[PDB]
């Protein structure tokens, strides 16, 4: 309980006569009096004047995530180190820096007037994300923890989302961790290969999700420009109305604008990136369900949420499935189906109520 | 042939769609149809007197583009005239894909056909070129280019959206000092001439009335004669109350504040005497200017007008005037008088000390000045320069190696002439040169610069055409220095029609090629592995 006084003395003389194992002892006094007496933990201030320095910063700020304006003394130190040893960032991201920089920029800093601070933290973040590889891990280590705000920032800064293992990648991972629908929507709308999104179905098909599936089908099979749903080649073991629901268009759907938060940080970082680089109706019709091995389609023959968009189908394909006994109730619901084909199924009798359909042609 | 192309899926934004059957060449390269099917055949291969070349698969591919364009119209008729199915094409005498078979024009591929359909073998584009000009994302959106008659100078246009069965574009005229309107269809392309005034026209607007099933057009001319003619009858005209200066900007609004349908019109005089009117009173000769709001002075001419993007805030209008930007609402009084000349980010001054040209309304404000290569991102509330987007910061980055002579051209040409903002995606900037800028206002600035299709993009605006809505009319220019030594230029105005989905397509296609390049290499590894 004297180290506080020792560091308080060192802080004075470290300034005036241009002092020159100083940094050594002032580091161990942290590990000697950690997680307590934040006054001696303000010593971080002197560091602004062996990777142990990294492991002692991210562990200090994290353990004091919302303690006081010691983050302002922490990040000032981290910013001072970065502008002279640019390599240091490879060490921060290597540790728990992600755990501490994602919290600050998302701890309700928006709606709070700490603009002086955020401009510091974004300036510090502007350098951690310089390297092309670091963004690819600043991003990946922001998907495991569900963080929609930051995963959107690292995308507006590059950091391709189709790089992890190629056979396996983000979207396959993000679908395993029971993520949030807002998180998947950002990987697909950005660079994301088809061969990886398709593998995300079978992963997300095994589990029953109504919003993580309907976001993959919307990117895999929906030709909005031609009013179609091309779900052919997919080996979806079964179709349910809760998935196709959000695919059909809705006129009432209108949203606010909330992603502007991640858009502000995207340019603020880009601003500090350059300034440091310069100086120095329309009801859809076609619905294809060809190769999906469906042993039954009854799930659609109810009064579910899509029973009002199926009445304008005008084409429906179920060929190469393993269907049987086309449901009586369905063939009276879609009263505008004019091109129905269902061949290679395992039928054993003509339903003979298919002809009761209102306006049908080209029954196959 | 259209029989050797094996589709894999009918989803447009897929990775593997078409695949040419490759077994045919294996059976030939071993057991050596060597002349090719009659209909889908080159002239150099049918005559049989000359060995083939790689330029034979291009003429055969050129025909494949002719059957995809016309959706197999030549083959259907070619089955009952097979001796004329081959000989008609065996010389490059096959007809126009549009005049014969009903199909959408697609006028940047009717040119690729007319190249792959040339008689001389080494004059047809090699296979590497026929793909590098299909990879362009501007070929797949340009819906139809409409060559206006020779030497017609138009600087104003207006579309008809209350009739969605078909549409027409009412133009103006500049090649005469006495003004004249120039009606123009879209499916027949019949350019019509009808003199309607004695002074050159500057802007028009289209006022429709929900009653009586008509939509008159209004004409602003330099003299001030505000004339109105009916859509059908080209004889019932009444020159409204003449103004004092040259009308420069008109508009038709959405102001239905009497619990029913009602609308106004805002004649923008060349000093700010904005006369407001009513939608149904336009018929009467000499209507009543409701609230003439003299805003600026004779040294402050209005040059634009706009309306909000959302309808929630009651369509707050934001119109420019001289260099002073203003706004109003149902009150019809100035509620903001932002001024731009007093800008504290001076690198050059007169870019802000000049007349305004156009302003678009969004979550921010984008403003254009005369001969200004920069747009100014102001804000509504703060009234500050939140963004300054210079043009040549993008043009000079592609015009480095492909343009070498420009080193003497430090007095660059190409200035912002018009703004048009897509709903929420991108911002269309028409440069004084031949370029057009696609700026994604959300995240990334430069999407693509679509050059070498005109010479001066003078007018640009959106419209909706025959239930295929959301097109982007682009009225450029074209000048050829045939008699430049006679201090005269031959101007050819070239109206085009871009699919408004262009900023998506250009970045949706650039991903489509990346995924296929990543597959073209991994497929080369299965050979070594």
UniProtKB/Swiss-Prot annotation, chain B:
PTM notes: Ubiquitinated by TRIM1; undergoes 'Lys-48'-linked polyubiquitination leading to proteasomal degradation.
Renumbered ranges of WD repeats: 141-185, 190-230, 235-278, 283-329, 335-379, 404-440, 445-499
Binding locations of ATP: 3, 6, 21-22
Superkingdom in the source lineage: Eukaryota
Outcome following mutation: residue 411 to A: Decreases WD domain homodimerization
Regions crossing the membrane: none
Listed result of changing residue 392 to M: In PARK8; shows decreased WD domain homodimerization; no effect on kinase activity
Outcome (variant: residue 177 to H): In PARK8; shows decreased WD domain homodimerization; no effect on kinase activity
Tissue: Expressed in pyramidal neurons in all cortical laminae of the visual cortex, in neurons of the substantia nigra pars compacta and caudate putamen (at protein level). Expressed in neutrophils (at protein level). Expressed in the brain. Expressed throughout the adult brain, but at a lower level than in heart and liver. Also expressed in placenta, lung, skeletal muscle, kidney and pancreas. In the brain, expressed in the cerebellum, cerebral cortex, medulla, spinal cord occipital pole, frontal lobe, temporal lobe and putamen. Expression is particularly high in brain dopaminoceptive areas.
Localization in the cell: Cytoplasmic vesicle; Perikaryon; Golgi apparatus membrane; Cell projection, Axon
Effect seen on changing residue 345 to D: Decreases WD domain homodimerization. No effect on kinase activity
Binding site for GTP: 100-123, 297-300
Function comment: Serine/threonine-protein kinase which phosphorylates a broad range of proteins involved in multiple processes such as neuronal plasticity, innate immunity, autophagy, and vesicle trafficking. Is a key regulator of RAB GTPases by regulating the GTP/GDP exchange and interaction partners of RABs through phosphorylation. Phosphorylates RAB3A, RAB3B, RAB3C, RAB3D, RAB5A, RAB5B, RAB5C, RAB8A, RAB8B, RAB10, RAB12, RAB29, RAB35, and RAB43. Regulates the RAB3IP-catalyzed GDP/GTP exchange for RAB8A through the phosphorylation of 'Thr-72' on RAB8A.
Clinical condition linked: Parkinson disease 8: A slowly progressive neurodegenerative disorder characterized by bradykinesia, rigidity, resting tremor, postural instability, neuronal loss in the substantia nigra, and the presence of neurofibrillary MAPT (tau)-positive and Lewy bodies in some patients.
Protein family (similarity comment): Belongs to the protein kinase superfamily. TKL Ser/Thr protein kinase family.
UniProt remark on domains: The seven-bladed WD repeat region is critical for synaptic vesicle trafficking and mediates interaction with multiple vesicle-associated presynaptic proteins. It also mediates homodimerization and regulates kinase activity. The COR domain mediates homodimerization; it also mediates homotetramerization via interaction with the protein kinase domain.
Subunit (UniProt): Homodimer. Homotetramer; when activated by GTP-bound RAB29. Interacts with PRKN, PRDX3, and TPCN2. Interacts with VPS35. Interacts (via N-terminus) with RAB29; this interaction is direct and stimulates kinase activity. Interacts (via ROC domain) with SEC16A. Interacts with APP; interaction promotes phosphorylation of 'Thr-743' of APP. Interacts with MAPT. Interacts with RAB8A, RAB10, and RAB12. Interacts (via N-terminus) with RAB32.
Full protein name: Leucine-rich repeat serine/threonine-protein kinase 2
Species annotation: Homo sapiens (Human)
Chain's gene name: LRRK2
Residues of the full protein shown: 1996 to 2527 of 2527
């Amino acid at each position: 309980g004297i180290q506080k006084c020792g560091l308080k003395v060192i802080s004075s003389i470290v300034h005036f006569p241009d002092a020159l194992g100083a940094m050594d002892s002032v580091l161990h006094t942290l590990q000697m009096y950690p997680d307590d007496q934040e006054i001696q933990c303000l010593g971080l201030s002197l560091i602004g004047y062996g990777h142990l320095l990294a492991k002692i910063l991210v562990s200090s700020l994290y353990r004091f995530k919302d303690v006081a304006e010691i983050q302002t003394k922490g990040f000032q130190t981290i910013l001072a180190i970065l502008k002279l040893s640019a390599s240091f960032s490879k060490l921060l991201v290597h540790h728990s820096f992600d755990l501490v920089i994602f919290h600050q920029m998302s701890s309700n800093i928006m709606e709070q007037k700490d603009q002086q601070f955020l401009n510091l933290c974004c300036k510090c973040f502007a350098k951690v994300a310089m390297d092309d590889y670091l963004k690819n891990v600043m991003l990946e280590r922001a998907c495991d923890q569900n963080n929609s705000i930051m995963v959107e920032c690292l995308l507006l800064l590059g950091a391709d989302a189709n790089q992890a293992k190629e056979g396996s990648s983000l979207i396959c991972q993000v679908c395993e961790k029971e993520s949030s629908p807002k998180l998947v929507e950002l990987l697909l709308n950005s660079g994301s290969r088809e061969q990886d999104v398709r593998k995300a179905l079978t992963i997300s098909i095994g589990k029953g999700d109504s919003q993580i599936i309907s976001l993959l089908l919307r990117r895999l099979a929906l030709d909005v420009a031609n009013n179609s749903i091309c779900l052919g080649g997919f080996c979806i073991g079964k179709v349910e109305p809760s998935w196709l629901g959000p695919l059909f268009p809705d006129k009432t759907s209108n949203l606010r604008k909330q992603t502007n938060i991640a858009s502000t940080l995207a340019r603020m970082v880009i601003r500090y990136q350059m300034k440091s680089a310069v100086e120095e109706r329309e009801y859809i019709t076609s619905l294809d369900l060809s190769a999906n091995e469906l042993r039954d389609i009854d799930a659609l023959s109810q009064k579910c949420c899509i029973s009002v968009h199926l009445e304008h189908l005008e084409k429906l394909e179920l060929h190469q499935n393993a269907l049987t006994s086309f449901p009586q109730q369905l063939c009276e619901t879609l009263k505008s189906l004019t091109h129905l084909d269902l061949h290679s199924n395992k039928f054993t009798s003509f339903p003979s109520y298919l002809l009761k359909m209102s306006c049908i042609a080209n029954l196959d | 042939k259209p029989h050797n192309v094996l589709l894999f899926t009918l989803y447009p934004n897929a990775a593997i769609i078409a695949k040419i059957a490759d077994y045919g060449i294996a059976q030939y390269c071993c057991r050596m149809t060597s002349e090719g099917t009659p209909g889908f055949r080159a002239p150099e291969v049918a005559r049989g007197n000359v060995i083939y070349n790689q330029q034979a698969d291009v003429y055969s591919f050129g025909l494949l583009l002719y059957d995809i364009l016309t959706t197999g119209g030549r083959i259907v008729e070619g089955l009952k005239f097979p001796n004329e199915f081959d000989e008609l094409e065996i010389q490059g005498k096959l007809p126009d894909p549009v005049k014969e078979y009903g199909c959408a024009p697609w006028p940047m591929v009717e040119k690729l056909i007319k190249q792959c359909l040339k008689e001389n073998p080494q004059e047809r584009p090699t296979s590497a070129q026929v793909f590098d000009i299909l990879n362009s994302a501007e070929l797949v959106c340009l819906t139809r280019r409409i060559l206006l008659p020779k030497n017609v100078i138009v600087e104003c246009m207006v579309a008809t959206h209350h009739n969605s069965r078909n549409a027409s574009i009412w133009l103006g005229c500049g090649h005469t000092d006495r003004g004249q309107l120039s009606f123009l269809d879209l499916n027949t392309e019949g350019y019509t001439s009808e003199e309607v005034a004695d002074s050159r026209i500057l802007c028009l607007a289209l006022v429709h009335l929900p009653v009586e099933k008509e939509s008159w057009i209004v004409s602003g001319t330099q003299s001030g004669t505000l004339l109105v003619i009916n859509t059908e009858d080209g004889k019932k005209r009444h020159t409204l109350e003449k103004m004092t200066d040259s009308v420069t900007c008109l508009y038709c609004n959405s102001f239905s504040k009497q619990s029913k349908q009602k609308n106004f019109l805002l004649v923008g005089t060349a000093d700010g005497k904005l006369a407001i009117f009513e939608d149904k009173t336009v018929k009467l000769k000499g209507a009543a200017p409701l609230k003439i709001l003299n805003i600026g002075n004779v040294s402050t001419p209005l040059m634009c007008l706009s309306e909000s993007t959302n309808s929630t805030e009651r369509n707050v209008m934001w119109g420019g005037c001289g260099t002073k930007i203003f706004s109003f609402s149902n009150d019809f009084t100035i509620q903001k008088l932002i001024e731009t000349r007093t800008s504290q980010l001076f690198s050059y001054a007169a870019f802000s000390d000049s007349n305004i040209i156009t302003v678009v309304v969004d979550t921010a404000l984008y403003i254009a000045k005369q001969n200004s290569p920069v747009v100014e991102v102001w804000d509504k509330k703060t009234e500050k320069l939140c963004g300054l987007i210079d043009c040549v910061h993008f043009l000079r980055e592609v015009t480095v190696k492909e343009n070498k002579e420009s080193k003497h051209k430090m007095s660059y040409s190409g200035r912002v002439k018009t703004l048009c903002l897509q709903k929420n995606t991108a911002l269309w900037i028409g440069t004084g040169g031949g370029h057009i800028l696609l700026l994604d206002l959300s995240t990334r600035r430069l999407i693509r610069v679509i050059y070498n299709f005109c010479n001066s993009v003078r007018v640009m605006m959106t419209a909706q055409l025959g239930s295929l809505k959301n097109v982007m009319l682009v009225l450029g220019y074209n000048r050829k220095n045939t008699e430049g030594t006679q201090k005269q230029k031959e101007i050819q105005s070239c109206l085009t029609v871009w699919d408004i989905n262009l900023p998506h397509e250009v970045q949706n296609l650039e991903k489509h090629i990346e995924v296929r390049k990543e597959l073209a290499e991994k497929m080369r590894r299965t050979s070594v592995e």
